[PDB]
Amino acid sequence: RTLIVTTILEEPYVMYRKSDKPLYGNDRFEGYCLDLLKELSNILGFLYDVKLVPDGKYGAQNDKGEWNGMVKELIDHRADLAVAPLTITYVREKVIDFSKPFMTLGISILYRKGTPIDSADDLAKQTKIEYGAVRDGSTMTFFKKSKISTYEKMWAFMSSRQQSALVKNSDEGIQRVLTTDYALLMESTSIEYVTQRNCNLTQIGGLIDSKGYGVGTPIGSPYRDKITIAILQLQEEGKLHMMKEKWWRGNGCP
Amino acid sequence: RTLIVTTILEEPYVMYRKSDKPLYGNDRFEGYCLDLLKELSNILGFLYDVKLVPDGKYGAQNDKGEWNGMVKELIDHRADLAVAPLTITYVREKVIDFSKPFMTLGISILYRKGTPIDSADDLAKQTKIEYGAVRDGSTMTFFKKSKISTYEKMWAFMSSRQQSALVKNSDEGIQRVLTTDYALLMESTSIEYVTQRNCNLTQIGGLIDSKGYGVGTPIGSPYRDKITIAILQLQEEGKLHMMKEKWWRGNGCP
Numbered sequence: 001r002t003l004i005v006t007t008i009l010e011e012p013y014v015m016y017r018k019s020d021k022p023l024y025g026n027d028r029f030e031g032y033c034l035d036l037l038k039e040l041s042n043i044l045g046f047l048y049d050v051k052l053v054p055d056g057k058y059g060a061q062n063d064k065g066e067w068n069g070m071v072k073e074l075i076d077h078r079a080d081l082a083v084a085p086l087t088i089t090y091v092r093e094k095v096i097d098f099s100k101p102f103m104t105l106g107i108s109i110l111y112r113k114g115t116p117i118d119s120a121d122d123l124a125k126q127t128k129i130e131y132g133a134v135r136d137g138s139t140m141t142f143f144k145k146s147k148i149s150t151y152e153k154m155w156a157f158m159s160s161r162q163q164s165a166l167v168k169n170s171d172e173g174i175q176r177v178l179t180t181d182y183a184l185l186m187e188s189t190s191i192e193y194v195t196q197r198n199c200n201l202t203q204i205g206g207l208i209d210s211k212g213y214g215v216g217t218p219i220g221s222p223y224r225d226k227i228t229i230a231i232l233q234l235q236e237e238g239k240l241h242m243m244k245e246k247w248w249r250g251n252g253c254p
Numbered sequence: 255r256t257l258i259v260t261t262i263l264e265e266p267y268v269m270y271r272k273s274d275k276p277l278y279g280n281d282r283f284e285g286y287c288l289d290l291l292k293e294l295s296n297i298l299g300f301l302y303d304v305k306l307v308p309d310g311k312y313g314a315q316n317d318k319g320e321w322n323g324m325v326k327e328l329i330d331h332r333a334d335l336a337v338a339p340l341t342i343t344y345v346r347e348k349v350i351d352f353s354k355p356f357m358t359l360g361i362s363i364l365y366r367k368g369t370p371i372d373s374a375d376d377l378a379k380q381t382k383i384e385y386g387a388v389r390d391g392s393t394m395t396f397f398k399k400s401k402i403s404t405y406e407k408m409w410a411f412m413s414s415r416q417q418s419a420l421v422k423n424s425d426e427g428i429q430r431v432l433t434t435d436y437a438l439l440m441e442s443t444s445i446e447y448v449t450q451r452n453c454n455l456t457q458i459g460g461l462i463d464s465k466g467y468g469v470g471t472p473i474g475s476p477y478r479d480k481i482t483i484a485i486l487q488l489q490e491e492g493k494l495h496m497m498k499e500k501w502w503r504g505n506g507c508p
């Protein structure tokens with residue numbers, strides 16, 4: 001009866017709450033995605049247990065084409081929903097069922113302020129500034145699969161030297177941008193959150209693609225359509241907008 | 255199989271081609287949506303027969319909850335697909351199925367350049383400049399249903415005086431903006447198209463909301479998921495972006 005919700009720590013979507021005593025169960029967590037789940041639970045009338053994905057991955061395929069991460073949890077019916085910044089992509093939609101998007105976004109560039117760099121092609125025609133993405137995430141996959149010239153050049157650079165330009169996670173990418181001469185290809189909603197908090201960083205250029213985050217369900221799940229309708233309701237009522245402004249607003253940067 | 259596709263004339267989605275002799279069948283039409291249908295038909299391997307919706311409407315409910323337009327064609331299984339700038343909304347998703355969005359947009363304001371107006375709250379707080387939307391479209395319905403104070407205010411104004419501030423169609427709205435002191439609340443992708451072609455008009459403010467256009471199918475159709483997967487493929491390949499640029503780009507503005 002109670003639904004199992006797979007998710008992953010990622011600021012400001014899902015974070016451990018701060019407290020002076022050990023926390024248990026759903027009380028461990030806060031964030032945009034917990035607020036979304038509370039609003040979805042309200043509308044649809046389910047109870048839920050939040051479970052962190054045991055392997056700490058979003059969802060990609062190994063050499064055998066077996067999935068991992070939140071995507072695999074859904075496939076195997078070890079979770080009923082995945083509520084996280086899980087990008088809606090062609091390869092994932094073949095294997096699980098996403099709701100319609102609760103957030104739309106695109107890949108863009110995180111870099112330091114004050115420089116002459118203005119676009120992905122400024123990066124691509126040069127080698128002094130290093131640049132990369134989180135290994136095996138949807139942004140990397142976009143560069144890997146692209147047949148657009150500029151993105152191909154960029155993939156050749158990223159993948160070169162046993163992928164030394166890639167990072168394991170966004171926090172590693174951020175620190176590399178802050179310390180060295182490095183630009184991170186990152187989803188725009190995460191760039192917005194980061195630039196609101198570190199005033200030496202900025203987004204470079206616009207969005208190079210367009211995509212959404214959606215709630216994952218196993219293929220065939222009856223919850224996919226109920227959740228899509230509830231998301232559309234929350235969007236039209238201004239509630240998704242309110243939730244984004246609650247979690248993104250920073251107060252310290254020009 | 256040959257699919258039956260319901261659609262509606264709307265620039266630059268679906269337009270009559272120019273020819274010195276009469277045109278027949280699918281050859282009557284061109285535009286972004288025809289290009290999309292060709293790409294979907296190449297991926298999924300169907301033939302198709304394009305039919306203009308007989309009542310010339312997108313789809314809205316009357317007081318008795320009865321539907322019209324392309325939505326009613328799908329509900330009644332008179333068409334297999336609706337391919338048009340058909341906004342994905344809560345009320346429509348309850349009665350038909352949409353693919354994931356092939357375009358993502360929001361309501362914004364079309365107005366003349368060179369004025370002090372910068373946002374919907376600027377319009378809401380006054381009564382001198384008239385403003386409205388296409389009657390019974392998804393933009394009107396957004397305002398009708400909103401409980402956000404600004405938008406309630408705007409709906410009270412739009413709906414006053416026997417809805418004299420509303421218009422029957424987008425071209426009527428565009429002419430009214432060009433001639434009189436009037437602002438049109440319009441989906442942002444159409445404002446883009448218009449302002450590329452009318453250098454005296456501009457978008458005012460940003461997007462008020464976030465929504466998409468999707469291919470519509472009857473509820474339960476097996477094509478909906480196939481078309482979603484095909485749209486995601488076309489997005490990731492950059493084809494949807496190239497299709498938008500092809501149909502939107504104008505001759506330039508001074």
Ligand SMILES: C=C(C)[C@H]1CN[C@H](C(=O)O)[C@H]1CC(=O)O
Pocket residue numbers: 010058085086087133134136137138139140169170185186187
């Ligand atoms: C935080 C990361 C690893 C996730 C979030 N959305 C993408 C995904 O769902 O693959 C990944 C980011 C990226 O690839 O830029």
Ligand SMILES: C=C(C)[C@H]1CN[C@H](C(=O)O)[C@H]1CC(=O)O
Pocket residue numbers: 264312339340341387388390391392393394423424439440441
């Ligand atoms: C062109 C119009 C009448 C359509 C297009 N999408 C909206 C729909 O699908 O309702 C309507 C526009 C709007 O309401 O601003």
Ligand SMILES: [Cl-]
Pocket residue numbers: 050051052
């Ligand atoms: Cl857990």
Ligand SMILES: [Cl-]
Pocket residue numbers: 065066067072075
């Ligand atoms: Cl698997």
Ligand SMILES: [Cl-]
Pocket residue numbers: 304305306
């Ligand atoms: Cl026809």
Ligand SMILES: [Cl-]
Pocket residue numbers: 098099100228352353354482
């Ligand atoms: Cl969907």
Ligand code: NA
Pocket residue numbers: 092093094095096097098219479
């Ligand atoms: Na799917």
Ligand code: NA
Pocket residue numbers: 225346347348349350351352473
């Ligand atoms: Na539906």
